Design a protein around this nucleic acid. Structure first.
Ligand SMILES: [Mg+2]
Ligand SMILES: [Mg+2]
Lengths: 64, 113, 135, 189
RNA sequence: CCGAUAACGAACGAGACUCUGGCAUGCUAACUAGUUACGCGACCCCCGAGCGGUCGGCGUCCCCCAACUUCUUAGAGGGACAAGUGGCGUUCAGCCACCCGAGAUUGAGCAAUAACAGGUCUGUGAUGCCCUUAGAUGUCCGGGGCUGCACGCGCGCUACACUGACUGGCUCAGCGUGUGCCUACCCUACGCCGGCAGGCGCGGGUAACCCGUUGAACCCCAUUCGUGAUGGGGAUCGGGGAUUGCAAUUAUUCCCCAUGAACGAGGAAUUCCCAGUAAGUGCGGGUCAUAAGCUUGCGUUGAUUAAGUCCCUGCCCUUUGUACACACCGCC
């Protein structure tokens, strides 16, 4: 029943958010399917190309 | 003090100086103390070059009401001989020599000397 | 970040690229040595900065015309502005297209009925002007 | 081939997930004889990625004031802990370390400034470098607290923390803190 | 800075500058700095090594009786400029990444207009006015006080331990000081006495010559302890012994033996900090007859986190509102 944990790759880093700069909005493309690319916000040091793991796919999205 | 400082200021400029500044501060006029600053010309304040272009003297005038301080700063003119003042140029002054024509647009020849 | 060149380094650079364009080049080192006989620069960190921005202008002046002048560029500004006179003028059209009203006006001047003038069919619809407001 | 501490070859360990593969540095290029090199790894950003992780673990054990420069003491602590885990489990000590880092890094956390429910507001997935940074910090704190007032030495307390983290048994302080971070993030999605 | 431009031409500040750090096997040199070489030794060798290994043992400016400047010192110079490549940018000003490079942002000093009823009359033979001036508010001498303790706060030191303490062994610094106008008071090698603090003789240094190859601490390597207020911690207190001084009581400081208290990581709050940084760790300078838990510098070991934001506290620019101008700690 539970959506399985997966792995997504950062195509571009949109910029900082959270009004303290702790979170960076990034554009993650799912490796399982290159077509599905969603925007997330991550905390910590980030750069293009690195792959982060996603406990669950779709939470929130917003343009800055 | 207004007239005396102006006369001092005019003497310094006439003698040849890039700038000057006199500040006579004390119990001028009434009991409340004020400072009068007469400044004209260039007058740097910061950096090392202050050490070799400006001359500062602080004097005390014991008038009846109290002590009336005097601060005089004179920026000396640059002089290659350096007797009248500093010999080093200001560090940020770049002076470019003027070239001649040096065109030579004519036919090439050989001068047998 | 924080390597903007102050006025002095830029302002000195422009003077020595108009005084001495021919001697200078696109090498930081060759130019940094000319700046040692053409100018009395008090500081070493200043000439290398001056020499550095000179290359940026000398690299740029080889292509575009930077505001700093140059005789060889100015003579071509002259040659193109003052010459390339077309052998056939643009204002010698063999046939001059003419609105009916202009032909009427030229008729009043009594300079109408010239052969070079050719009347044109007047436009119809009076559809000039742009639709008012947005949309 | 480089034999870290003169043994424990580096050309056999492996990282089970590509998410952390490029911020762990146990392979041949970042294989060193000893976890000690003043390599200027904090000069710029993502230079601590190419710092070998044994060096990263060593740099994090020197904490709580008493031990702020004592890298030689920490190197022998890592050396003694690595000898124990190979003896106590039977596989390559580096392999246990990489599994410990992989298994201890909290996959998501929570952070915001608005009016929080319990701790933080919005659940945010962490970066792969924060994964390693948190994993190393959690293991060291677990070994630190476990040996603060007991006869068991730092090397043994560090040894069991990496062994427990490499498996995940609700016994390592690191994974216990990791599971707690997941629950807060999950409850604060 | 680039650019538009009712502005044009300027001035100060910033920047440039000065010092410091990092590289120069390139130059100048060094018996007040050394290194290599050679010659003596002293040992271990010995198989036999022999241009063997070690020596901070001794010589070769004890001028004819080595060279050289790598290491040390300090002068003149060089070097780094966003210079080169790629990308972004109005392709301008510039920004990002990378190669080569010691270095692609080392730290300080100086630091504008205007102002504060900010601090100093206890720095001055700086000073106005006022006060006192022989039973002095002058000056000197003796004693006491500035330390006094129901309590509150601030800067710190020591800790709560085993990532430790203890005992022994091993092994590494750098700033910098050193005998005094008055002015009395210097830094100390070596030998002997003592358990220690110390004492007694002999020297060296006004100093790259002597202390001093500053044999520092942490650290390192072995020992004992073993999770207990314990060999943690050393507060309090008793006895005794030295040093300084004219004088040590209200203990100057130091040493020795005893007592071994709170303290088991600290509520609300709150400080500082981005790379040789924080922190651990000692060492010099100032004060100094006597003395550092202070301060100013120095070296040693050496990280976690971050390359962001305006959320909190504030700053800068523009627009806006205003009943404010002692200016929101305002006005009402
Ligand atoms: Mg400046
Ligand atoms: Mg004991």
């Amino acid at each position: 029943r539970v959506q399985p944990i997966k792995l997504a790759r950062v195509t571009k880093v949109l910029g900082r958010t959270g009004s303290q700069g702790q979170c960076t909005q990034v554009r993650v493309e799912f490796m399982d399917d290159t077509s599905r690319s969603i925007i997330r916000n991550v905390k910590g040091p980030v750069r293009e190309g690195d792959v982060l793991t996603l406990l669950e796919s779709e939470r929130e999205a917003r343009r800055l | 003090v207004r007239r005396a400082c102006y006369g001092v200021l005019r003497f310094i400029m006439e003698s040849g100086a890039k700038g000057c500044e006199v500040v006579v501060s004390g119990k001028l006029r009434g009991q409340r103390a004020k400072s009068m600053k007469f400044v004209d010309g260039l007058m740097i304040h910061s950096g090392d070059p202050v050490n070799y272009y400006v001359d500062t003297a602080v004097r005390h005038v014991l008038l009846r009401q109290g002590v009336l301080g005097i601060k005089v700063k004179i920026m000396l003119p640059w002089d290659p001989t350096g007797k009248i003042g500093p010999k080093k140029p200001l560090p940020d002054h770049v002076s470019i020599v003027e070239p001649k024509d040096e065109i030579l647009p004519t036919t090439p020849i050989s001068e047998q000397k | 970040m924080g390597r903007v060149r102050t006025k002095t380094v830029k302002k000195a650079a422009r003077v020595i690229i108009e005084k001495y364009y021919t001697r200078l080049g696109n090498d930081f080192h060759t130019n940094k040595r000319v700046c040692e006989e053409i100018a009395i620069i008090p500081s070493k960190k200043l000439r290398n900065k001056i020499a550095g921005y000179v290359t940026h202008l000398m690299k740029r002046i080889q292509r575009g015309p930077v505001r700093g002048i140059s005789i060889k560029l100015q003579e071509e500004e002259r040659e193109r502005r003052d010459n390339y006179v077309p052998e056939v003028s643009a204002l010698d059209q063999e046939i001059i297209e003419v609105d009916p009203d202009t032909k009427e006006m030229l008729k009043l001047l009594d300079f109408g009925s010239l052969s070079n003038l050719q009347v044109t069919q007047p436009t119809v619809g009076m559809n000039f002007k742009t639709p008012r407001g947005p949309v | 081939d480089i034999k870290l501490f003169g043994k424990w070859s580096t050309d056999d360990v492996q990282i089970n997930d590509i998410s952390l593969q490029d911020y762990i540095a146990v392979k041949e290029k970042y294989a060193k004889y000893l976890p000690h090199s003043a390599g200027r790894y904090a000069a710029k950003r993502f230079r601590k990625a190419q710092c070998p992780i044994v060096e990263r673990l060593t740099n994090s054990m020197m904490m709580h004031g008493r031990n702020n420069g004592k890298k030689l003491m920490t190197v022998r602590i890592v050396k003694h802990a690595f000898e124990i885990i190979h003896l106590l489990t039977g596989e390559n000590p580096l392999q246990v370390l990489v599994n410990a880092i992989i298994n201890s890094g909290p996959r998501e956390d929570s952070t915001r400034i608005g009016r929080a429910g319990t701790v933080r507001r919005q659940a945010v997935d962490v970066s792969p470098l924060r994964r390693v940074n948190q994993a190393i910090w959690l293991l060291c704190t677990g070994a630190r607290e476990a040996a603060f007032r007991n006869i068991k030495t730092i090397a043994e307390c560090l040894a069991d923390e990496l062994i427990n983290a490499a498996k995940g048994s609700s016994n390592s302080y690191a994974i216990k803190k990791k599971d707690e971070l997941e629950r807060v993030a999950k409850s604060n999605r």
